[PDB]
Design a protein around this ligand. Structure first.
Ligand SMILES: CN(C)CCOc1ccc(-c2nc(-c3ccc4c(c3)CC/C4=N/O)c(-c3ccncc3)[nH]2)cc1
Ligand SMILES: CN(C)CCOc1ccc(-c2nc(-c3ccc4c(c3)CC/C4=N/O)c(-c3ccncc3)[nH]2)cc1
Lengths: 228, 272, 271, 229
């Protein structure tokens, strides 16, 4: 099971909707010291995002039931909910741990650095979306510079029609409104990201236009809802 | 002339009742809908109402108006119209209580308001608006039926106070439909039947007829925009001469439709 | 009386050219489609054709027939119908090169045959069937528009030999209408413009008249059922009286719709 | 307790976490008490969903293997992963089957209860039948039909032909012949008739039974059209 063989196994798991086996294999691939290429980066991103997405949605629907029933039905929902964060925390902690030992320390190219930092800050945000109490203040504090450090790296050596920078700006804006509750700052930085995108349509090639414009409309969709 | 020779209009499974007849799922140049009273040798005055019903449907040509295909005299008095895949909005809110979407709720609201705007252009008054007439054609288009009582009593929830008072020969007016439309907008946004606190009919006529009872907007769902909420209050006013006409209603609905937000409150989703 | 007063209709983006003029996306109680000649001082015999066009569309009321809303006299002789958002069948098959499922192909074929039965039930002949005239409202329903040459030359790909050989002053017959439907059926199932390997016009007009020309059935998709192949052949017959009328074609398609494998895998417990 | 586990499984239904739902409902059967209609459905949906995901996972990977010929290494690597799905489908099917043979059928009291679990036993044998191969393949095909025939015989004597449970048995039984034993003539023969007697007694059909039955009735007609062609 070398680098090439392990990558193929993830692809079959991707086609078979076996996300758990996809993440388990892809975690081993990045734990060998090799420098991941562009396509392996998408496979790792797809693997760990989908597994969290199902658990995130499970908590979101369960949390709706818990706070909309007012005995014994409240404790059983809380007990079931407490199991959700447990599964969510270790899967998020696993990604955070693996990023800081193998990916970021060996991250040579800056565009690869900004991807991992963008991906890194999300898992603090996912925990921030559910962690309540004194731990919430600490966990959001660590996420703020990860978004900030990634944003400034793309601010200089990376194009603003690039999907990743545009995706980072979309991912950077959502943090303030959904966690920090600062719509004034979120929309302001979303506008300049939107304004920097609209001013350089004469540079994108015939490959990256599709993903960039898909993220481009998502910025508009949030902005209209935010301005309400 | 729109006379159809008899025998062509077959009669299928019974669906329900209409103004003064019973509807059927017929077959005449495709899937159609036919409503007949199944009473042979009808009274002459009901024929006059039946004759006047055709004279009104023959003057309606719109997408948001149920398409009148023709009328059959023999063997039984009936009219043949379009068949709407699905059911009325009443079935979608009182039988299955569909969890509707706000972006769709405005679109269905705009289509209905567009339907009566065309009717009022031809100086046509419906006088029989209710949620049982909002036929949701395969969940995209809306048609307006029940043109028997219309001209160029009702259901105890969908009239304006002026007509409950038993005023002069023509108590229904252009604004009377607007209040009825406003009652319709109440059901779409709340998702609940209006006047649900009172389960009687003798009490409801006295309290709303004289103006002592009006719908309350407490049950409207939270994510309903403030602009839509103001419009509902503006159309349910007690006096007819101050209600906003349909041309203003369409502009207000379309104005907030552009500014209406979407769902999935946050994106954060690259394709990858 | 649908004679609209002047000034009640706006004009939007130019959509295209219809039978005797250009069509526009108007705004009159919602989005509409208005057809006008945009020519001042209308020709005296042009008004004769225009009044019959309104006088024939006023007799059609069907879900599968384009809905005629009204007509205008001043400042222009214009006719306005409903707006079928989406595109036409010509755009789907020859511009975008779209692909539909086997159930969808019959659905379009059944509906355009469904509406045409209504037209011939009122002794009305369309005379200009063509894939530009098959409008797909909301991508599902099919509407029959462009009643410019109706009764009670444009492209020749969709007309009949019975109107090519310069027959009596009434060559437009019911079977001639049926033939144009058959060519449409060729367009649907084969998914290709008929006579793809012919690139001229003067040869086509003479060859169809003498009976030496007919679309080749080699381009038919293998998944097409054999029932349509018989119907296509019986509808493409050169002679007039040997072509079935629409009600039998309409009933033939409904028989095929039931015997069609909608699902490709055996259905289990829905749960 | 009893109510707590029912609520726990119902809570897991809205969270799209069927693995937890199946585990909670498994202990409800082991309690030994009779199961009401609303909790029998929870048993069916929880176990059907968890095995349905594995069924699709095996189906997709199997299609890939046959379409990637020419390279033996790619063919080789798909086999063990298919066997991982093969075995994972086996434990879940064996889990319910062992539960069926030990606590559900013996404790059944009503005739409708007995046929319902007999249909499930044949169904979960059919799921393993569609994936297993070799000498043991026909054995589990053999036991599956015995559960079906026992279910079919009991169903006709007691339940009305418009009963949705009987319709589901006939629909599942018809698919078993065509997909597994490859006998469309016998599969269609029962499928063609089973539609008719339910049609023959639509007069006694209740409004509540109008909704659920017609989905099964149309699927039987839908299945018949596919097998006819
Ligand atoms: C729920 N409760 C009200 C009990 C009762 O339920 C009913 C449910 C549904 C209905 C129902 N009336 C119609 C209806 C109404 C008016 C007219 C027609 C059909 C044909 C001619 C006409 N002129 O106004 C339809 C319908 C129309 C078009 N396409 C499909 C259906 N459907 C009537 C009663
Ligand atoms: C030639 N160049 C412009 C390229 C593009 O070609 C065309 C593109 C599009 C078209 C086109 N004509 C119509 C059309 C045809 C007939 C009639 C009307 C519109 C209004 C009333 C009428 N009487 O015949 C439509 C259309 C109709 C309804 N809904 C949507 C569209 N679309 C015609 C030509």
């Amino acid at each position: 099971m070398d680098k090439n063989e392990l990558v193929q196994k993830a692809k079959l798991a991707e086609q078979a909707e076996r996300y758990d086996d996809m993440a388990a294999c892809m975690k081993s691939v990045t734990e060998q010291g090799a420098e991941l290429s562009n396509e392996e980066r998408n496979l790792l991103s797809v693997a760990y995002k989908n597994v969290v997405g199902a658990r995130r949605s499970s908590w979101r629907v369960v949390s709706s039931i818990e706070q909309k029933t007012e005995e014994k039905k409240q404790q059983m929902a809380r007990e079931y909910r407490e199991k959700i964060e447990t599964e969510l925390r270790d899967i998020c902690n696993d990604v955070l741990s693996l990023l800081e030992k193998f990916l970021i320390p060996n991250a040579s190219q800056a565009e690869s650095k900004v991807f991992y930092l963008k991906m890194k800050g999300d898992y603090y945000r996912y925990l921030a979306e559910v962690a309540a109490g004194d731990d919430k203040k600490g966990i959001v504090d660590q996420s703020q510079q990860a978004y900030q450090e990634a944003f400034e790296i793309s601010k200089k050596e990376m194009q603003p029609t690039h999907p990743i920078r545009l995706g980072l700006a979309l991912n950077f804006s959502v943090f303030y409104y959904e966690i920090l509750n600062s719509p004034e700052k979120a929309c302001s930085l979303a506008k300049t990201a939107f304004d920097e995108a609209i001013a350089e349509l004469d540079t994108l090639s015939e490959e990256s236009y599709k993903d960039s414009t898909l993220i481009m409309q998502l910025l508009r969709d949030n902005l209209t809802l935010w301005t309400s | 002339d729109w006379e159809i020779p008899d025998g062509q209009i077959t009669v299928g499974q019974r669906i329900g009742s209409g103004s003064f007849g019973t509807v059927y799922k017929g077959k005449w140049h495709g899937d159609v809908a036919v409503k007949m009273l199944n009473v042979t040798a009808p009274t002459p005055q009901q024929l006059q109402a039946f004759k006047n019903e055709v004279g009104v449907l023959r003057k309606t040509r719109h997408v948001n108006i149920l398409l009148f295909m023709g009328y059959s005299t023999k063997p039984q008095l009936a009219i043949v119209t379009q068949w709407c895949e699905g059911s009325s909005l009443y079935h979608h809110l009182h039988i299955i209580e569909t969890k509707f979407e706000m972006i769709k709720l405005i679109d269905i609201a705009r289509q209905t308001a567009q339907g009566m705007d065309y009717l009022h252009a031809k100086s046509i008054i419906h006088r029989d608006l209710k949620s049982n007439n909002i036929f949701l054609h395969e969940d995209l288009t809306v048609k307006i039926g029940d043109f028997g009582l219309a001209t160029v009593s009702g259901s105890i929830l969908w009239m304006a106070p002026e007509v409950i008072r038993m005023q002069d020969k023509n108590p229904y007016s252009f604004q009377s439909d607007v209040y009825a439309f406003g009652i319709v907008l109440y059901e779409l946004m709340t998702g609940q039947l209006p006047y649900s606190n009172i389960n009687n009919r003798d009490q409801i006529i006295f309290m709303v007829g004289r103006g002592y009872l009006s719908p309350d907007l407490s049950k409207v769902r939270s994510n309903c925009p403030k602009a839509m909420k103001r419009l509902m209050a503006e159309c349910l006013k007690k006096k007819r001469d101050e209600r906003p006409l349909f041309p203003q209603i369409l502009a207000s609905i379309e104005l907030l439709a552009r500014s209406l937000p979407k769902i999935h409150r946050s994106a954060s989703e690259p394709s990858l």
